[PDB]
Design a binder for these strands. Structure first.
Length: 181
DNA sequence: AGGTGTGAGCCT
DNA sequence: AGGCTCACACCT
């Protein structure tokens, strides 16, 4: 049937172990790693749209204390619900199935910025969630799919240097800093 | 054009 | 210190 698997899920888990962190900024920040998924079991000729949002992973604020993540408290008023529609939407199942669906251009921010942006609240842990929707009649239908490997804490600066190291290692745009010699 | 971390600078 | 921001020199 409909199956949706995470591409490069293992890079996500490598980050998860160390407690993953995603920078947000005022102008909005791209994710690394990028969320990419494989889809199967769609109707090749049906029309679907893909949506992405972020759900709170627990109720505590967090803080980094001497090389370790520890909870804080007082979860600031939950962030406004935002969503990002994949720019290829709407499109045929064939298109969504022919190659991994990658959310490379979504931008995460800490301000009520608009235009394909998701506002997160800093020092909170969030989980990406992907949705598939089909408008029709009997085939009317929305799925949601979570990937615990991709949980992360929003931050305005990296805190675990080991995370920064992995970011620099794999994100091509930080390749200039990977001059590790 | 457009994304990346690093320092530096800022307020509390 | 502790969190947020902005120029910048790199990269794509």
């Amino acid at each position: 049937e409909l199956r949706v698997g995470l591409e490069e899920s293992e890079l996500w888990l490598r980050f998860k172990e160390l407690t993953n962190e995603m920078i947000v900024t005022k102008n909005g920040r791209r994710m690394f790693p990028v969320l990419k998924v494989n889809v199967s079991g769609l109707d090749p000729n049906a029309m679907y749209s893909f949506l992405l949002d972020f759900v709170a992973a627990d109720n505590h604020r967090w803080k980094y204390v001497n090389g370790e993540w520890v909870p804080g408290g007082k979860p600031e008023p939950q962030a406004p619900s935002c969503v990002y529609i994949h720019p290829d939407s709407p499109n045929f199942g064939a298109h969504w199935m022919k190659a991994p669906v990658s959310f490379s251009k979504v931008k995460l921010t800490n301000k009520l910025n608009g235009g394909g942006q998701i506002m997160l609240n800093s020092l909170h842990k969030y989980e990406p969630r992907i949705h598939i929707v089909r408008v029709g009649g009997p085939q009317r239908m929305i799925t949601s799919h979570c990937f615990p490997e991709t949980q992360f804490i929003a931050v305005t600066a990296y805190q675990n240097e080991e995370i920064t190291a992995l970011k620099i290692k794999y994100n091509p745009f930080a390749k200039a800093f990977l001059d590790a010699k």
